[PDB]
Structure formats: structure tokens, C-alpha cells
Amino acid sequence: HVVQLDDFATRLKAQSKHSVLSEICDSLETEYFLKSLIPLFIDPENKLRNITLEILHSNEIVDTLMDLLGILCMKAITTLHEKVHPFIDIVIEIYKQLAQAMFSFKTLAESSLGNFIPHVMKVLQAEARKAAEEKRANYGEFIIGQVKAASFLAYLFIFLEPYQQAIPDIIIRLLQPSELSAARKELLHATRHILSDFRKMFIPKIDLLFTAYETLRPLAYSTVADFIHNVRDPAQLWKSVSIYCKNLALTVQIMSAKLLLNLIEKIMRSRQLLMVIIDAYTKRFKMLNSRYNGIMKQHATYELLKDSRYLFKTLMTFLKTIMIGLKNSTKEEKDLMEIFATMFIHPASFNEIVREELPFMYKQMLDFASLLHIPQFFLASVITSSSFSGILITFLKSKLVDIKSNILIRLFKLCFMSVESVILPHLNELILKSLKLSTTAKEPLVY
Amino acid sequence: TPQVLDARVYLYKRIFLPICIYESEMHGLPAWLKSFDSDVWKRYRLELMQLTALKGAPTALTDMRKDIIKFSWNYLDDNTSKQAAYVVTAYFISRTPSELTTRIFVALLRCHDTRYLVKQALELLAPVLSFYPARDHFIPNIITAMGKLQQLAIDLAELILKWETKLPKSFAQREACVTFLIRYICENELGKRALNILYELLGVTVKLQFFERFLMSLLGYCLNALEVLAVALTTWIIENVSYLQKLLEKCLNQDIQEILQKVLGIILEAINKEVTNFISLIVNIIGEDLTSVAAGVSLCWTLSLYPNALDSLLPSIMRTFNKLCRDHIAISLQGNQPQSGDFANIEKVTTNLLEKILNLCAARSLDDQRRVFLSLLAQLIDRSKDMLLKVINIVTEWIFKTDFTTKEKAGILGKMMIFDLRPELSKKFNQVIVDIFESLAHTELTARMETAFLFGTSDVSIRKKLMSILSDSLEIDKRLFYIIKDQNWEYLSPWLNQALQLLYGSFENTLSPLQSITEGLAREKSIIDFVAKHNEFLDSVAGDILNPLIDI
């Protein structure tokens, strides 16, 4: 009754706290190990608590006190009544040149800075640089605690060769904590590199730290840091664009960051860039569109399509429109015809068909009147199936935005081969006769 | 190509891939040598569709050739892809055994940095759940204990060792106590799936394991203890530890709702099959810690964990939820401390005095709170001294509903709820005629409140019927169907309004009810002869409308 409010209010409203609270509460309140030991840690202690509690006795429960609170080595004796006494004496005997000299000499001759620097650094120069620069579990724990505390305190309270060159040896040697290394390395490398060799120093972290945060944070971190640092100031563009574009919910961020950073960095600086960018974008868009269209069509027809259809249509339309508009200033016909026909044949029909169909005439423009026109009419007319928006939108937009190959091949093949299946003759004859007769052009030789 | 141009690699790879893909996919032991040599010396539709789209010769030849070729040729992606695809397709599609079990168990158990341990441990340990009981059941202790010595090794070794070692029992004290205590005393999918599957599928050890594991224990203890203790549901420790741990750990984002709802529902349902601590702590913590999970779980648990329980307990949840949401999402009033004064009731003048004094003294997005609070308070307080409640409720409802965009909701909600729970013509006719003629809740609320209030009871009938029928018919299915069905059904059991409004307003599928019901009821139930004969004969001139006129 009064022991909870009196002991909790009197003990919580104000060593001396453990002996006064445990002695007054235990001596005045006369199952008590969790309630009496949880209050001492939830809000010269091991010597007085272990000597008074062990000498004034109530055995194994005393070990629970080790989970609560130079003088802590005696607490190791509580684990008795080189492996059950050396951790408290070696870890508490050296509990700022004392931290780097005692931690480096004691750890090298055979966690306090990370857990103690947050209280003094968050509850309110030589210790961060000396402790972080002067640093098998001792290397990973001291390097991770000193690098995380120095990087978090120095980066949050407002050089990279030691942490970048030393993180791969301890992480690779100890892995045979990704948020602190990825956030501290990405924020320190992006802020230090952008506030003023990126492939060699950044390829070890992404190539050795792999596993979704390390592989997903490298696209936005390496693309934003490499694009902002490299663009804000020939091997960096080919190595970063080839490794970043060839090494790839991470599909939207990796495809958008790699396509936007590679297209903006490669177009913001010449047939090698347009041919390599058109071949890589056409091969990646054709492979991703063919794999997503085949997997979505087989999985949806063999019986999360909004994310794959919206991400594939938005990424393909944005990448094709950005690459065509930014680069227009035998793999192209098969990749563009197979990606456009396979990705477009599966209010979104007008924007998706117009934006996905305008890249052929807009990206082609000059020439491309035989291979680019024979594959669209042959591939689009040889499949049929159930489609009407792509034929009218692609035929009306492509034939009206410029046309003789579609009307001649469609009219000659449909009229000569025609002798659900009868709906292509009326729509093809009405669309071809209305578009060709209403286009107001010469040509003739068809009536 | 790594030292550097795209036409040579793209044209050589694309032009050279057709010979190996067409030759390897059209020439058929060749899939393992061609796929392993071609894929390892440097295609998914043909191998996946041909290998997955296809009785002892196929299983023995495919298992012996794939196991002998993979085990004999594997001594990085080819082993994990071929072993995972062949083991997943064969194990998932298979739902002669001596050669495959003895060869696969002896070769996989005798043939034994993250790719080798994860692919070898996951691929070699994933097929154990699909003479052999001794080596298969005894190889997991030496293989898991010798290969387990970073979350993939402990999760795959603990889940494969606990599932494989515990699945054969359907010496167990050391493996069950060490695996359950070591695996449960320590990333949420591995601990929750391994602890929930091992603790829920594994069953003197219940008292030491449950008391030591449940008493020796912040998200892992509450999630593992609540999920493991609630998935397979001595009652004082589980009820007090589950209610105190769930209320104290959840009272300080699906973990709090799932752990609190699962621990509260499993602890209350399992312990309700000492009541002051569980009822006061569960009612105070559940009623004070607070969209369908809270209303459904709080209303079903609070209304079912107690005929007067639902009506007498609906005012605390309705007044606490409406007063807490309205007083916490807008404030700027004086009704924020109503939970401590209104929730202190879970222990005919007590219900009327406590409900009328608490609701009238504590009641001093508005359509849901005003209609739900007025309808729930009036129906619950009136469905259970009559001069004070009737005069106070009629004077407060009539003065508050008549003394007020807010006029349609307040007048329609207060007049419809107060008049149906037992100056509107100018505002309803002007607002409905101006809003309906100057161009969804105004049509349903005005049509339902005006039709129900006007039809559920001499110038008011002619003015309201002529103005409502002329203004509503001179300009949509709810007004014609409700007015025609309510006027014809209520009047067929005055002839100028129904005959002139129905005959002058009915001139397509809803017109058969008025002519069929009026002609059938008026012609079969026998100034009415001129309106009935003129309206029926003039409006009936298609087999139902002409068969009754010519046959009757």
C-alpha cells in the first residue's frame, strides 16, 4: 500500500542510493531482486554493494545485481560464488590520452567512449581525433564505437582514408551495425566530398559491405555524392556509370538515381556517349521491360501489379523521354521495338501510349524509316491479341505527328491477307483511310 | 572488357548467346554440364519453364543425375541457383526413395565466406524437412553444432536444428531446453518465427521453462513472450505478466497494437474462461490508452467481457471516444477531463440520474459526434422521474436543435434523431429548393428526414405536399421512390395531391410501382372514381399495365 508510493516516490524523488534505497526499502518493507534492482538501473558501488550484500546475507539472485550497477572487479566475485574475472578487471581497470593510450596499449598488448561520450556530448576535439584516429573484437568494438561516436557527435554537433581504409579490414576480417557505418560513411563522405578517387574509395564499401541497406544505400549515396562532388567541381564517368549502371523497392531508387545521375552527368558535359548511353539504356530497358512484362504476364495469366506497372511504366517513360530528349540534341530496333511493343502491349492509356509511343518518332526523327517502321507494324500487327488503344494511339500519334510504311504495309497485308478477327479490317481501313486521307499529303498511288 | 567498345561486347554477347541458348535449349546430363560449364566458365525461361513444366525414371534419373552432377561437379551462383531451384521445384512439386535418400543423405551429410555457409547451410538444411532417421536425425546435431560456430548461421542453424530435431518427435530435454532457452533468451522474423514455431510446435519442463523464460526477461521480450505465449493459448503469472507487460510496455507501429491486442485478447479470453485487478487494470488501461481495431476490440471486449451491459456500457465508450477525440482533435473548450469523471462507473433512478447528470453535465466532423452522441445517448438513456427526463430531453433537444451548413445537419440530425428515437419548412424547402435547383448528404438527409418526419405523423399537408411534390417533381430516385411509395402505401390504406402529383409527375422503370400498386390496390380494394378512372385509364394507355385495365 504505502510501500509503493513511499518507496517509489521517496526513492525516485531524490553508493548511497543503493544502500539507502535498498536498506531503507528492504529493512522498512519487511521477488525483491527485480523490484529492488530494476529501480537502481532504470533511473564505489560494487565494493559496498557486493561486500555489504555478500557479507550481510540471497546468492544467485545477487548475480542479478551485476545487471544493475577500478572497484567493479569485485563484482566479478559475484559470478564465482581467466574468463569470468578478467572482463570486469580488464574492462573496469582503465575506466584524452588516457583513453587512447590505455585502450590502445591494453587492447593491443593482449565501448566506454561510445556509451560515455553520448551522455556528456548530448546532455549539454582531441578526444575524437585522437581516440578515433589512434584506434579481434577490440579493433571492431573500439573502431566502431570511436568511429560511430566521433562521426555521430562531430557530424551531429554542427580524414576519410583512415575510416574508409580501416573499415574494410575490420569489417571484412571480422565479418568472416550497418546503419552507423552506412550513415556515417555516406554522410561524412557526401558532406566532406561535396563541401569542398571516388570509385576506388567508394567501391570497397559497396563491394565489401554486401544486405539490402548496403546495396540500396550505395545507389543514392554513391550517385548523389559522386554526381554532386563530380559535377560541382574520363575514368570516373565510365567506371562509375558502368559499375553503378551494370551492378544494379530498390529498383525505383536504383533505376531513377542511376538513370538520372548517369543521364544528367553524361549529358551535362560525341557519338560514343549517345551510342553507349543508347545501347546501355536500350539493353537495360529492354531486359527489364521484357522480364517484368513476361513475369507479370505469366504470373497474372497463369492464375502487386500496380507497383511493377507504375514503376516500370514511369521508369521506362521517364528514362526513354529523358534519354531521347537529352540525347537527341541493330540492337536499337530490336530493343526499342521489343521494349515498346512488349511493354506497351500489356486515363493511363493516353499518357502511357502517347509518352511511350512518342519516343520512336521523337528519338528517331532523322532516317529510321525502314527498320524502325517494319518492326513496329510487323511486331504490332503480327501479335493482334486484344488491343485497340496502342494501335489507334500509336498509329494516330505516329502517323499524325510526322506514315507510308504503316498504311502501305497495313493496307497491303490486311487487304491482301484478309481475303474478333474481323475487327482489324474495319479499324485498320477506317484509321488508315481517315489518317491517310485526312493527313493532307502527296504520296497518292493508292486509290 | 573489364580493363576498358560497347558494339563488340553487345554484338558478341547478343550474337553469340543464340548459339548456346538455341543449341542448349534445342539439343535436348546436358543441362548440368552446359549450364554449369557455360555459366561458370564466364536462358531462365527455357530452363525454368522446361525444368519446371515437366514415374520412377524421372525422379530417379533427375535426382540421381542432378545430385551426382551437382555433388560431383561442385567440389558460386550455379550451386545456389541449381540447388535452390532443383530442391525447391522437386520438393515443392513432389508433394526409388532408397537411392535418393541414401545418396542425398550420405553425399550431403558426408560432403560437408557468407555465400558458402548460407548457400550450403540453407540449401543443405532446407531439404531435411521434405535407417535414414538415425543419420538424418543425428546429422543435424553434429552438422548444426559443428557448423554453427552472423544472423544467418544462428537463424538457419537454430531454425533447422529446432524444426528438424523437433519435427521427428511427432535426450529431448537437453535439446528442447537448450534450444528453447538459448533461442528464446536472446531480426524479428527469425526470433519470432523460430520461437513461435519451436515453442508452438514443440508441445515438469513447462514450469521451469515458462517460469524461468517468462520471469527472467524490451521489444524482444514482449514480442516473443506475447507472441509465443499468445499463439498457443498458473493463470495469475500469465494474466498479470501479460496485462502488466502489455499495458506498461504499450502505454509508453503495429507492434504495440498487435502485442497489446493479442496479449489483451488472449489473456482476457484465456483467463476469463482477482477480478478487480484484471477488470480495473484492463478496463482502465484499455479505456484510457485509446481505427476499426480499437472500436471493435474495445466495444466487443468491453461490451462482451461484462441485456443492460451493452446499453449501460455503450455510454462510456461512446462518450469517452467522442469526448476524447473531439476534445483532443480540436480542444478550445472545457471538457478534457471527462475520462476520469466519466470512466469511474464499472464496479431505475441510477441510470437516468447518472446518465442524465453525467451526459448533461459533461456534454457542455460534428455530424458524426453530434448524431452518434445524441442518438446513442437518447436511445440508450431512453431505452432503459419521467417528467425531468422527458421535459429536460424535449426542452434541451428542441431548444438546442431549433436554436441553431450546420443548420441542415443540426436540424436534420436533432429533429430526425429526437423525433425518431421516441420553422423547418422554410429552411428545408428553401435550402432544398435553392440547393437542388441552383445546380450527397443533403438529398438523403433532407429526403429521409422530410419524408420520414412528414409521413410518420390542414395547411401543412397541402403546403408541404404541394411544395415538396411540385418543387421535387418539377426539376433523384430516393425522392420519387420514397415519396411515391410512402404516399401511395400510406394513402392507399387528399386525392388531389396524390393524383395530381403522381399523374402529373409520373409522365421509367419506377413508374410501374405507382400504376401497378395504385391500379391493383385501388381496383382490387373496392371523387375517387374520376381520379382513379381518369388517371388509370389515361395513364394506362406493357402487358401488366394493359392486362389489368382490360381484364378488370
Residue numbers in the entry:
A (entry chain B): 3 to 16, 21 to 36, 44 to 56, 70 to 83, 95 to 106, 114 to 125, 134 to 147, 188 to 202, ...
B (entry chain B): 1767 to 1770, 1773 to 1796, 1809 to 1822, 1838 to 1849, 1852 to 1872, 1875 to 1894, 1897 to 1913, 1916 to 1933, ...
What does the paper say about this structure?
While lobe B improved only modestly due to uncorrelated domain movements, the resolution in lobe A reached 5.7 Å, thus showing clear density for helices and several connecting loops. The HEAT repeats form a central solenoid overlaid by a ring structure and adopt a cradle shape when viewed from the side. In agreement with early antibody labeling experiments, the N-terminus of Tra1 is located in a short protruding tail containing 10 α-helices corresponding to residues 1–250. Extending the tail, the central solenoid comprises 11 regular HEAT repeats up to residue 928. These are followed by a linker domain containing three helices before assuming a regular ring-shaped, α-solenoid path, of 31 HEAT repeats. Although the available model of DNA-PK does not contain the full set of HEAT repeats, the comparison with our Tra1 model shows that the overall architecture, shape, and size of the HEAT domain, as well as the positions of the FAT and kinase domains are almost identical. The kinase domain nevertheless maintains the archetypal two-lobe fold of PI3K and the loops that carry the ATP binding residues or the catalytic residues in TOR are located in almost identical positions in Tra1. Strikingly, TOR’s helix Kα9b and the negative regulatory loop sticks into the catalytic cleft and plugs one end of it, while in Tra1 helix Kα9b proceeds in the opposite direction to interact with the FAT domain and there is virtually no analog for the negative regulatory loop. The TRD2 domain in FAT is shifted much closer to the kinase forming new interactions notably with the kinase FATC domain known to be important for Tra1 assembly. Within the shifted TRD2 domain, three consecutive helices that are highly conserved among Tra1 proteins (residues 2698–2753) form a bearing-like module that accepts a rod-shaped density, probably an α-helix, originating from lobe B.
Here we present the cryo-EM structure of the entire SAGA complex where the major target of activator binding, the 430 kDa Tra1 protein is resolved with an average resolution of 5.7 Å. SAGA is organized into two lobes, one of which is fully occupied by Tra1 while the second contains enzymatic and chromatin recognition functions. The interaction between Tra1 and the second lobe relies on a single and narrow interface forming a hinge region. We find a sequence motif that seems essential for the intricate HEAT domain architecture of Tra1, we identify a structural core shared by other PIKKs including TOR, and we illuminate a resemblance between Tra1 and DNA-PK, a PIKK involved in DNA repair.
